[PDB]
């Protein structure tokens, strides 16, 4: 299947070169997979989700996304127009308040919620978790992501937007998950993107157009935007049966666009998420 004039990020993960505007993907499009968007929540009523998104858990007074970050990242995972896996089921876990902040204990609780709740859902193709959040190093935040990963969930986390080494940030520094750095439309490392050896993959992170609260859309930047690309990519490939949750990050790096990014500091992987689709 081919989506013309797709957001540059979708077209980039379906191409070996930058500058295309068509997102090519297998029409299964993540059908049968589930992605938990652990963020500010998801406006599940947005027409772009077509009934495939729903709130499953909040840690605040409402499950409503008052921020828009979670709806944006959910839209990048699998909204109709802005999503990588356009047929996937989106579950929203609101661990961050309407200002975008959250306690580590709340974020650890949300990760442990996904590890259990996936046993009550119907995800025959696999379970994915998109963690578009980051803070300083925390051995407990790292451990919760490792437990999420070990329980059988493809965990994708943002490398962080500090232009620093990601080893000082959690859950980015947890090696068992999929730490995702950010790139722009000219295949440069995003100027904000964290780097380091703990990084596993890069995705489109600068000026990512996706859903927003109020039934709207907007473009924003961050490794928090590159993470749902890889989370949606993992969901998309798990549905195709090419990978599993334990092996998806390793598989995505093996099939990535190698050496195509500039400004990648020495020691940091030069790998761009790539769906490897051949129409
Ligand atoms: Ca290339
Ligand atoms: Ca890793």
Swiss-Prot record:
- Taxonomy of the source species: Eukaryota, Fungi, Dikarya, Ascomycota, Pezizomycotina
Q: What is its EC number?
A: 3.4.21.64
Q: Which domain of life is it from?
A: Eukaryota
Q: Which GO terms describe its molecular function?
A: metal ion binding; serine-type endopeptidase activity
The keyword Cell membrane is assigned to this record: no
What cofactor is needed? Ca(2+)
Biological process per Gene Ontology, one example term: proteolysis
Q: What organism does the record attribute this protein to?
A: Parengyodontium album (Tritirachium album)
Q: What is this protein called?
A: Proteinase K
Q: What positions does the entry give for Ca(2+) 2 binding?
A: 16, 260
Q: How is the cofactor bound?
A: Binds 2 calcium ions per subunit.
By sequence similarity, the record places it as follows: Belongs to the peptidase S8 family.
Q: Where is the Peptidase S8 domain?
A: 7-279
Describe which stretch of the whole protein the shown chain covers, with first residue, last residue and complete length.
106 to 384 of 384
Q: What class of enzyme is it?
A: hydrolase
């Amino acid at each position: 299947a081919a989506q013309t004039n797709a957001p540059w990020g979708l077209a980039r993960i379906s191409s070996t070169s930058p500058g295309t505007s068509t997102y090519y993907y297998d029409e299964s499009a993540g059908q049968g997979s589930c992605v938990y968007v652990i963020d500010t929540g998801i406006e599940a009523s947005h027409p772009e989700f077509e009934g495939r998104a729903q709130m499953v858990k909040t840690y605040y007074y409402s499950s409503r996304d008052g921020n828009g970050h979670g709806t944006h990242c959910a839209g990048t995972v699998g909204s109709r127009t802005y999503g990588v896996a356009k047929k996937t089921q989106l579950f929203g876990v609101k661990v961050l308040d309407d200002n975008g902040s959250g306690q580590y204990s709340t974020i650890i609780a949300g990760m442990d919620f996904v590890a259990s709740d996936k046993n009550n859902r119907n995800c025959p193709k696999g379970v994915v978790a998109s963690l578009s959040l980051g803070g300083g190093y925390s051995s407990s935040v790292n451990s919760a992501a490792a437990r999420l990963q070990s329980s059988g969930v493809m965990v994708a986390v943002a490398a962080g937007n500090n232009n620093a080494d990601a080893r000082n940030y959690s859950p980015a520094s947890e090696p068992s998950v999929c730490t995702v750095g950010a790139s722009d439309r000219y295949d440069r490392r995003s100027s904000f993107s964290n780097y380091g050896s703990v990084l596993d993959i890069f995705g489109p992170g600068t000026s990512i157009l996706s859903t927003w609260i109020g039934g709207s859309t907007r473009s924003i930047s961050g490794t928090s935007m590159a993470t749902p690309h890889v989370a949606g990519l993992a969901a998309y490939l798990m549905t195709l049966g090419k990978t599993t949750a334990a092996s998806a990050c390793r598989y995505i790096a093996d099939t990535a666009n190698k050496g195509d990014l500039s400004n990648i500091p020495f020691g940091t992987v030069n790998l761009l998420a790539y769906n490897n689709y051949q129409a």
